[PDB]
Amino acid sequence: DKIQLFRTIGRVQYWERVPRLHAYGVFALPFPMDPDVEWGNWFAGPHPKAFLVSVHPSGPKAGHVYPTDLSDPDSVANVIGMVLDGHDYEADHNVTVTLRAAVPIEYVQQGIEAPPLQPDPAVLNAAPQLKLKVIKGHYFFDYTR
Amino acid sequence: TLRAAVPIEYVQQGIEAPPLQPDPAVLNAAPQLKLKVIKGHYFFDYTR
Amino acid sequence: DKIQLFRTIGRVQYWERVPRLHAYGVFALPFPMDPDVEWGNWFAGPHPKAFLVSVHPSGPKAGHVYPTDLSDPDSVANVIGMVLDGHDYEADHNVTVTLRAAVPIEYVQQGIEAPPLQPDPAVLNAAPQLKLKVIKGHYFFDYTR
Amino acid sequence: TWSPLAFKESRVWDEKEILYLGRLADEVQAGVINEQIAESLTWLMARMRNRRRWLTWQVMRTGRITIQPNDPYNPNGLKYVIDYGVTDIELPLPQKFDAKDG
Amino acid sequence: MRVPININNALARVRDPLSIGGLKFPTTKEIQEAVAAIADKFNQENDLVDRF
Amino acid sequence: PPYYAIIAGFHGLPQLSGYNTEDFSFHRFKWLKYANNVQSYLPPFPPKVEL
Known part of the structure; x- marks a missing residue:
């Protein structure tokens, strides 16, 4: 076995960030992140992804964000917005959270075991109590209201 | 003003309430006042 | 945390290649390596390290060499020599086995859980039935006899 | 490695005070905000030097x-x-x- | 003994050209390299009694 | 509702010049508490006039 035919030893995928409605507006405020969350597998993958964050209203971690537990009713009730195409979690632990945007439904998944570029059916199911509204295949949200 | 975003230290209801301080009577009733406290500011829009 | 001051991210140790007695003589013959042996943890580490091999006397893999099981009386009885230097086990599956050399006792360790640059006390215990003779802290072996 | 920090700040003047303030002794025809902005403009340059x-x-x-x-x-x-x-x-x-x- | 490496070519090579960080796209950055040689300065040879 | 706005900021941080390449240590400045009762040797200051 002294030949060693061709293989791919490394791949790079590059994308375009996230389509967003120009006319609906942006509003963002950065919150501190939770150190108890493995933030690595939430910012993994080159593909576009957005996900919901919830804030601790009290306790020793008050004002920190963590990804929204759709099975926990208090994590659903404490949503504050989405993170869009997340940042360097290694060099910084304060993520910019977007509170008002309009994003297509194909770019939002909660599960790590959820395929990229598909609508997450758990977000569509919980969309009334997540204060989301689906209009023409797009989530409309604003958490300042 | 029906829509603005004001820091919480500038909002006092009672006359017997010190200025430049947060008001715990407003903060307790801020859900049913349709206010929302995000990072030391009140967010309100009363057109909705 | 924002700087990550200084961490060593790569280490290379470069050793010298397992000294032996010039005057005792060298006699080596290549043997086919056993595919059922994980050879990756026998050639691991930069340390000067040699180890015993036994050949399958019969069966479907007759003529193939495997590292010597010191607890098996048949693997002890079927020893054929040492692999002194370290083989490119990925490309080739045919190791050059030294049948006659004179090697110090500091460089011959059998187990993976055995400290380098120290004598293996199981080999010193089994040196009569392994046909080894310890003189001046050196092993003397010839498996042509 | 090394990566910086970020800091910025804003200030807004509403519609009442732009033409409903003059001096306090005499009478002035609504031009004092051009004096009060130019201070607060200069003040914010001092804020960034004070943060550094x-x-x-x-x-x-x-x-x-x-x-x-x-x-x-x-x-x-x-x-x-x-x-x-x-x-x-x-x-x-x-x-x-x-x-x-x- | 010295380790047989290039000093020049090892610094330009130990950096991943096919890696992206937490940001999903390659970032702007700036890189400087430096070389140190480590030798024990205080292990000297007894040159006294060479003349005696 | 006509209005007017100013925004100011920048991005930055301080960075040290160069550490020790043998063992990764930095010491170009250190702090020493040299004495306790030093304000006994010092003249007083005017208080803050607050109108």
Whole structure:
């Protein structure tokens, strides 16, 4: 076995960030992140992804964000917005959270075991109590209201 | 003003309430006042 | 945390290649390596390290060499020599086995859980039935006899 | 590695005070906001110089940038503990120089 | 013994050209390299009694 | 509702010049508490006039 035919030893995928409605507006405020969350597998993958964050209203971690537990009713009730195409979690632990945007439904998944570029059916199911509204295949949200 | 975003230290209801301080009577009733406290500011829009 | 001051991210140790007695003589013959042996943890580490091999006397893999099981009386009885230097086990599956050399006792360790640059006390215990003779802290072996 | 910090701030003047304030002794025909903006414009240049010297002195004094949530001029509640490499910043001296023992 | 490496070519090579960080796209950055040689300065040879 | 706005900021941080390449240590400045009772040798200051 002294030949060693061709293989791919490394791949790079590059994308375009996230389509967003120009006319609906942006509003963002950065919150501190939770150190108890493995933030690595939430910012993994080159593909576009957005996900919901919830804030601790009290306790020793008050004002920190963590990804929204759709099975926990208090994590659903404490949503504050989405993170869009997340940042360097290694060099910084304060993520910019977007509170008002309009994003297509194909770019939002909660599960790590959820395929990229598909609508997450758990977000569509919980969309009334997540204060989301689906209009023409797009989530409309604003958490300042 | 029906829509603005004001820091919480500038909002006092009672006359017997010190200025430049947060008001715990407003903060307790801020859900049913349709206010929302995000990072030391009140967010309100009363057109909705 | 924002700087990550200084961490060593790569280490290379470069050793010298397992000294032996010039005057005792060298006699080596290549043997086919056993595919059922994980050879990756026998050639691991930069340390000067040699180890015993036994050949399958019969069966479907007759003529193939495997590292010597010191607890098996048949693997002890079927020893054929040492692999002194370290083989490119990925490309080739045919190791050059030294049948006659004179090697110090500091460089011959059998187990993976055995400290380098120290004598293996199981080999010193089994040196009569392994046909080894310890003189001046050196092993003397010839498996042509 | 190395990567910076970010800080900015804003200020807005509403519609009442732009033409409903003059002086306090005499009478003025609504031109005083052009005097009060130019101060607050100059003031914000001093804020960024005042922020630089704080972070600069925080290294020179402790070697440790710390920014906590409950803090002056951190309304946004952020978290930064930036440790530099200053080794043994305090010299040991158990009897200072003016102990005057005896 | 010295390790047979290039000093020049090892610094330009130990950096991943096919890696992206937490940001999903390659960032702007700046890189400087430096070379140190480590030798024990205080292990000297007894040249005294060469003349005696 | 006509209005007017100013925004100011920048991005930055301080960075140390160069550490020790043998063992990764930095010491170009250290702090020493040289004496306790030094304000006994010092003249007083005017108080803050607050109208």
